[PDB]
Amino acid sequence: HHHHFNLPPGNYKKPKLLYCSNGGHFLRINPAGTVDGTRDRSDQHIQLQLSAESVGEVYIKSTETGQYLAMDTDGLLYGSQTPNEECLFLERLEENHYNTYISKKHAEKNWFVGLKKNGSCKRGPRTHYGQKAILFLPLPV
């Protein structure tokens, strides 16, 4: 293992909004396959269904389009039509409260899902433990 194993509570029964306390944006997977954030709670591309592939390993999928969140070889988040190795994330508890998501494929490099204060996603290499950009709270839809 490259990382700890404190897991968040909650489950995967219902879809969630992934709220980033850094700028208050919800993670959004656009139909074109781009990924960013928005503060508009009425957006139809922020409702995400998570599922556990293995304990602590999840897929994050848009319920509106069926796309899977994924992180590419250069660290950019994208929406994938089919599940692949870039779509698995290590879901962990952080600061005894938040949920963080580490790219399983690049877990040794500590590449997280993260949103900047301006709503743009962070590139894997620019994320790291300790940032506010990587802290999420799953909210009910």
Curated annotation (Swiss-Prot):
Outcome of substituting S120A: Decrease in LRRC59-binding
Binding-site positions, heparin: N22
GO molecular function: fibroblast growth factor receptor binding; growth factor activity; heparin binding; integrin binding; S100 protein binding
Effect seen on changing S120E: Decrease in LRRC59-binding
Outcome of mutating N22A: No effect on integrin-binding
Positions of short motif Nuclear localization signal: 13-16
Keyword tags: Acetylation, Angiogenesis, Cytoplasm, Developmental protein, Differentiation, Growth factor, Heparin-binding, Mitogen, Nucleus, Phosphoprotein, Secreted
Impact after mutating S103A: Decrease in LRRC59-binding
Chain intervals for the UniProt region annotation (Heparin-binding): 116-132
Post-translational changes noted in the entry: In the nucleus, phosphorylated by PKC/PRKCD.
GO terms for biological process, alphabetical: activation of protein kinase B activity; anatomical structure morphogenesis; angiogenesis; branch elongation involved in ureteric bud branching; cellular response to heat; epithelial cell proliferation; fibroblast growth factor receptor signaling pathway; lung development
InterPro entries: Fibroblast_GF_fam (IPR002209), IL1/FGF (IPR008996)
Effect of K122R: No effect on LRRC59-binding
Protein name: Fibroblast growth factor 1
Species of origin: Homo sapiens
Organism classification: Eukaryota, Metazoa, Chordata, Craniata, Vertebrata
Gene of this entry: FGF1
